[PDB]
Design a protein around this ligand. Structure first.
Ligand code: HEM
Ligand code: HEM
Ligand code: HEM
Lengths: 726, 726, 308, 83
């Protein structure tokens, strides 16, 4: 039962493009990629080659194929300890999934700042451009279970654990700059509303159901983040192509004790890019693991996800100078008002070894801050501090979750805490309390100071009575949704209208749809009317007369809120499908692959069967997947080289591949006789912007294709796609 | 610095006698002691000196004295993540105690065989006299909680984890050679009966209650082990001075495949020694930690517990050669019929560092055997195999309890099991199943063989129908209790009678007492009558006429079953109280201490207060304890030197000290004017055997005293103690 | 039938003095003692007389004496689902004991006010002397495990669950009017100091050891409660003969919104009484369940613990 | 035991039998049933041995396994009949 003679069962331990080699554990794929945290896991990494199969007690197993029984057709015997241990371990493999963000995908990397930030913070990880901090990052959806699909419409989580020299800092953020609700007390109400309904546990991975829109209609504070969710921000192309935000205002504290308010940002260096809805929903069926897969394969290819950390900084004295409250997590701070200052770069460059041990058991918590950082009174941040430690006690089995290898600090940790389930550390200290004289009081408290000091909270002034009351300054709900709406391109606005229309059409109780349309009328009449028309609802005269909400500190728009208004495309790490035929013109393929390789764009060679095809010059071309096996949903663009086109001209799947790519606004390039396929997509002898066409695939043909790919999608095609039946 | 200037907070890191230094974690007390297991724990040992106090996430704490609040008399704030972690870990410190044997005390050591046993077993740890195997041993009671008292009347557990090169072997035994019940199906019934009664959860650490003796009276299989429990076996002096047994017949399997039946023995190299009942019961009040303390202090002193492993070996063809069934765990194998063959020595030479991490979390399971051993059909052993892995899933929080440091094999372990709560090991194997090609089928099964082979069970023949039926060969209940009884000295018999009499006096429902008396009449008439008289029960004429049970294979006694019939005294490690006065005769103390030192006997110097007293010659004598502080219960003998006796002659505590020791049969030595104390214990002018007296404490005064100590107690004093009010 | 002919196995369901009858579950001993909470437990109370022995799945058991095996001297079979459920349930009986106050003894009762307190509090259970509130009270020591002794020197816990018409109120007090420490942040330090020391887990149920007195010496805030623990307060004769205190100042709030500061007290109607030290220590060996037994037998006798 | 938190999973309402269930098992996490039986073991006299074993029979009898003959050696071996 052995490995093939040719070694083909084992991936090469070098970077390789997606599909070229089977995927593997990060330490076997990239053994020479290291960082302090990855090295520190070596105490628990376990190999396998050349070792005997044993029980967990170290007893060699002779027959792992059979239970012990009284005769070979007889009853199994109670004394089979080998069977019992193996089955008992299997029986207890599962642990509770995260209450939210159960579905997530993670990787290791490192961070470093561009310059010391000691003027504004004493945080050690921000103190020196040449001090590298290992990180572990998990990206996630919110609503669905661990086994739900990746490319749903949802908010995404973006959690980073920095293993710093002065402690672990977890920056536990999402991919939009606000949240749905103002006070943590409502969190279980909002999450219950979005999650599968309690009677029948439907729907998975979708906000398109009555209870969510019932809560939204009755809680207008939710409308800002609902706008972001209904836009294409809700369906990113990759975790590499979305923004990250800490949402809350936090504090930075410098050595002089000065507090500066801050909001955290991550900028994706691969650019912002999202799917369109029909593509994202069909992709949850064709590959529900698409984002997990794409992230792992990018890292194996060397297309490391990179993000720039940035800070919006507001001096203490400017706390009240905006027309929103800085502590309200449903309000964003527009970059036109407060620019994002670039802080440092994070690069994710190694996949884990074991998903369960490292991803599933990772515990992030926004209370894990370090000296130089502090909280504010944001009432959603405040309540989050009661949750993340608590939930970890059932999910991870008790209070020693920081000893699970992935969660361990790389810096020293010593205290008087003892015992708890699954206690790993064996403490030698004669004392388990302080103050003590029997160990001369060690370990000892450390005064706060400029570097290496103990944690002290900023001495913020508190004055108020003990109340359960929402601050009046939080009671405005329409101006930020409007700012967001007005900052989108026209095609982005169409996509928002379509998201609301699609979701509300799934709400069974029509009055809820009506109540939501009335809320949209308080944001923008054009948005409200367009959603209403799709729902067969007619706005009343009163609704038509609702005064729009005020501008945000005079802003009519802020283009930083759009995915696409400002070009920032990067083609490196994108993928093209190349549709083969049984006599491919090799000069086309040479030019195609050469130009793709120059820009770091991968290719997948597709055909109507697996195996190989031979090109016109005898080159044997291995086939990656069939047209049906790897649909156009999984690539950024489609190229059809010249060759024996009649081979594929009447193939339904090949035609369909182009129809689906066209519908989803992807660039398509057709060389030589492949231009015969123009007829399937109904599109003119003169040509069309978004369709590259020439006699052969040369320098020019490929430059045009790659230019289109840098703009991500062919938005100008949108009016043409409603008539195509795909 | 809170430690004293003089460094008297820190115990000397060298062997010191009990009470000389404060006790300490083993790696601090005895850093030079080592074995392979203790070395392999070093990766999880955590020190403390010179380290900052931190959270578990590695953030330095500045103020570990206060919560974060709004104003120094204001409310505590939710944002206090340092408070929240510290209190949350504290809130989750406890894990379930063991369902049985929850009270126990453990130490590290090592084992070495005297010679290779390869002719009878291929067990690697028995293959070479040079092969030393680390062990971890936990002794225990059975009934009481982890916080119950040590010197109760109960069975004791004696569990040894051998960290062998071919897997962990757990020898999970007790201090008597049989158990109470025959089939594992009744274990919850017998354990419910002996445990605190379910309405009110009384009594702790005691079988002296109705439900226990109800069960016994209805289940005569239990009488054998009940005789043992009622004897002085049920109240050992020390874990160092008790026997151990595996109880069941197991098999040894050699390299040629030959099975030999075996029963396991531990022989205490310090000899056999028990308390007397009143002393044991009082001792649960004055020092409920006495066995735990004595074991730890013996190891700190270098009085390492030593035991010899012994095997009773019975050829397969002798299975049926006895009057009892070899597979019946209520039957012992008389050493007169099958001698114990010496196998090797175990030495316990290092205390844990942390009680919770190493002792409380240790998991032993008799299913944990290695190649060269195997099971038999003993139906109590059979059922044990269903329980010990199971219970560890809740007690230790899931199926990775073998990854808790104390439980980890020292030899390799590799398999395809994955996940589970608190998973430590990060598996890099591409495969988590077999057969696989993708990791060339590693780790791989190993055929069985002479050494380093896979586990194969002995191909014992099974034939019979599927039945829930007791073997008729097990249905004999009285002959072994009788053999045990007749093998005891007359004072041991007296103490058995008094154990049943006291326990049955605490049974509220008189009929249960009568029913037990009826059972005893089936064992021996002298026994039954003597208990009956203590209970005001008169035997009937039918009871007086029950034929006693047959002898066991012609034996009318076996002196190996007695604690004391064959003296095997060892004074090393025992302890003597020395009652001081304010003008001690220094020459007496010098002689006493010199003699005790030479035989490795410790001393405690006692007075009526702490501090120091000064001898006739100006020698300053420090006081270890008061008379009331360290009662006679806690030592093996009492010496009163000469001096200013009038100082203590009218001290009630000093007089009582001697009365209590006298009652409990301990040697007492009185020098010079200390002889005045003869009157308090009513000793005749010309003396009596067991009281050592002279004008001074020597020439022969110390030899006489140490001769009495070697015989443990003064049994000939028994007729005398009833008159003494103590 | 295994019971005696004369019925002497079953205790009389009438009050009887200590030792006169075997003690029994409270609904069998005093079936007509009732309060709203006791009655509400009837949905989960399970009897036993005259019912077949079954598995937890309701399958009747023929032979509860033997495992299933291949031959009467053969190996035990994996298919014995009856043996497996019974042993599995036994294997999982224990739950973690309380981190502190693990040793404790409890009973049901009721509370009634002497007068309406509506002038000082709107708490419904204090609104009318005819308002009867069921209670469940647990008395405890602090340091020792669930299996440690009762008559140790320790503080005692005195916790009352009031099942009121407007919610459960738990008054979680001790038998001294102050605590050892000022700020909850130090609780794990104080508790670790008094608890068995971590190297060897000694001593049980005792403050008489180095780490406790090390902490007290370095933390003079402890000295007040330490005085109480060193007094005979530390060794009550009975949970019926000790005081209870809430310790903290709380507030009462009335219907007008007026706050009054309050401290809570329980005053024993059997009066105050403690043992002496030598008696208490010795009693931990002769009867480590002495307080638990005393309380149960007092209630069986009709000597109901009463507190004001 | 892990998925449902302990050995009292048959007391979760959906899993409860509708017929009587009585035995000597006690405690476990999440225990709902409050047993009043003086005994928690059998055989006992203090509750006249109730709840009692029931012989097998045509209806309402105890469970007894069919007495299938077993004959063979203790082996970890697949039957050739399965190959
Ligand atoms: C701005 C608002 C919030 C953001 C950006 C946020 C972000 C996240 C992210 C990214 C994760 C997953 C971390 C991972 O990958 O393991 C997560 C988990 C979680 N969050 Fe939040 N969250 C927010 C609000 C809240 C609130 C208000 C609560 C409760 C008060 C909460 C409770 C939790 C819980 C219980 C988990 C599961 C954590 C675990 O099992 O380890 N979240 N959150
Ligand atoms: C010859 C008869 C038996 C002997 C010699 C014996 C011995 C022991 C000992 C010494 C321990 C404590 C190990 C330690 O120190 O951690 C123990 C624990 C235990 N035993 Fe046994 N036992 C016997 C019968 C049984 C039976 C018949 C069962 C159930 C079928 C059983 C189930 C248990 C359980 C559940 C534990 C707690 C184990 C743990 O929590 O790790 N025992 N036994
Ligand atoms: C005035 C001070 C205190 C008093 C009067 C008090 C009283 C008590 C009592 C009587 C119990 C036992 C309740 C029962 O019988 O189940 C108990 C349990 C407990 N206490 Fe306190 N206590 C005090 C301080 C604290 C502090 C400061 C903490 C921690 C911040 C704490 C944490 C606990 C915990 C974790 C338990 C176990 C509760 C359980 O498992 O259900 N206590 N306390």
């Amino acid at each position: 039962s052995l490995a093939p003679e040719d070694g083909s069962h084992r991936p090469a331990a070098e970077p390789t493009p997606p599909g070229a080699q089977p995927t593997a554990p990060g330490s076997l794929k990239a053994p020479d990629t290291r960082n302090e945290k990855l090295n520190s896991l070596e105490d628990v990494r376990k190999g396998s080659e050349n070792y005997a199969l044993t029980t967990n007690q170290g007893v060699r197993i002779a027959d792992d194929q059979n239970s012990l029984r009284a005769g070979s057709r007889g009853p199994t015997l109670l004394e089979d300890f080998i069977l019992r241990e193996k089955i008992t371990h299997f029986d207890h493999e599962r642990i509770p999934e995260r209450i939210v963000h159960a579905r997530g995908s993670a990787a290791h990397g490192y961070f470093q700042p561009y310059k010391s930030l000691s003027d504004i913070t004493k945080a050690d990880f921000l103190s020196d451009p040449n001090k590298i901090t290992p990180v572990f990052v998990r990206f996630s959806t919110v609503q669905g279970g661990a086994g739900s699909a990746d490319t749903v419409r949802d908010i995404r989580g973006f959690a980073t654990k920095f293993y710093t020299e002065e402690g672990i800092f977890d920056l536990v953020g999402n991919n939009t700059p606000i949240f749905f609700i103002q006070d943590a007390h409502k969190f279980p109400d909002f999450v219950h509303a979005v999650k599968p309904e309690p009677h029948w546990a439907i729907p998975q991975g979708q906000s398109a159901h009555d209870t969510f829109w019932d809560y939204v209609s009755l809680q207008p504070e939710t409308l800002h983040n609902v706008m972001w969710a209904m836009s294409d921000r809700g369906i990113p192309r990759s975790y590499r192509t979305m923004e990250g935000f800490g949402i809350h205002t936090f504090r930075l504290i410098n050595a002089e004790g000065k507090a500066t308010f801050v909001r955290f940002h991550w900028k994706p260096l691969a650019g912002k890019a999202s799917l369109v809805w029909d593509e994202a929903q069909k992709l949850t069926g064709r590959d529900p693991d698409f984002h997990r897969r794409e992230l792992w394969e990018a890292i194996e290819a060397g297309d490391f996800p990179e993000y720039e950390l940035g800070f919006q900084l507001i001096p203490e004295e400017d706390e009240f100078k905006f027309d929103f409250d800085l502590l309200d997590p449903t309000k964003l701070i527009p970059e036109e008002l407060v620019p994002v200052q670039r802080v440092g770069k994070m690069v994710l460059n190694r996949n884990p070894d074991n998903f369960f041990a490292e991803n599933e058991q990772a515990a992030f918590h926004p209370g894990h801050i370090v000296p130089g950082l502090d909280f504010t009174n944001d009432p959603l941040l405040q309540g989050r501090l009661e949750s993340y430690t608590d939930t970890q006690i059932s999910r991870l089995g008790g209070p020693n979750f920081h000893e699970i290898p992935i969660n361990r600090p790389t810096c020293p940790y010593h205290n008087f805490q003892r015992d708890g389930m699954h206690r790993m550390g064996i403490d030698t200290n004669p004392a388990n309390y302080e103050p003590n004289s029997i160990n001369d009081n060690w370990p000892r408290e450390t005064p706060p100071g400029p570097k290496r000091g103990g944690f002290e909270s900023y001495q913020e002034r508190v004055e108020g009575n003990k109340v359960r009351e929402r601050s009046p300054s939080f009671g405005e709900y329409y101006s930020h949704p409007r700012l967001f709406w007005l900052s989108q391109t026209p095609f982005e606005q169409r996509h928002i209208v379509d998201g609301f229309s699609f979701e509300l059409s799934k709400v069974v109780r029509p009055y809820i749809r009506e109540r939501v349309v009335d809320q949209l009328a308080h944001i923008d009449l054009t948005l409200a009317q367009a959603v209403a028309k799709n729902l067969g609802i007619e706005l009343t005269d009163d609704q038509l007369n609702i005064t729009p909400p005020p501008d945000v500190n005079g802003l009519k728009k802020d283009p930083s809120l759009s995915l696409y208004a400002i070009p920032d495309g990067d083609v490196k790490g994108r993928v093209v499908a190349i549709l083969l035929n049984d006599e491919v013109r090799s000069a086309d393929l040479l030019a195609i692959l050469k130009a793709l390789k120059a820009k770091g764009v991968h290719a997948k060679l597709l055909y109507s069967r697996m195996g190989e095809v031979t090109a016109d010059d005898g080159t044997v071309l291995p086939i990656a997947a069939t047209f049906a096996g790897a649909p156009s949903l999984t690539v950024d663009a489609v190229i059809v080289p010249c060759g024996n086109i009649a081979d594929i001209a009447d193939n339904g799947d090949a035609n369909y591949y182009l129809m689906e790519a066209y519908k989803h606004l992807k660039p398509i390039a057709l060389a030589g006789d492949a231009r015969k396929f123009k007829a399937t997509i109904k599109i003119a002898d003169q040509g069309e912007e978004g369709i590259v066409e020439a006699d052969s695939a040369d320098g020019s043909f490929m430059d045009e294709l790659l230019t289109l790919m840098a703009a991500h999608r062919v938005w100008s095609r949108i009016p043409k796609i409603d008539k195509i039946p795909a």
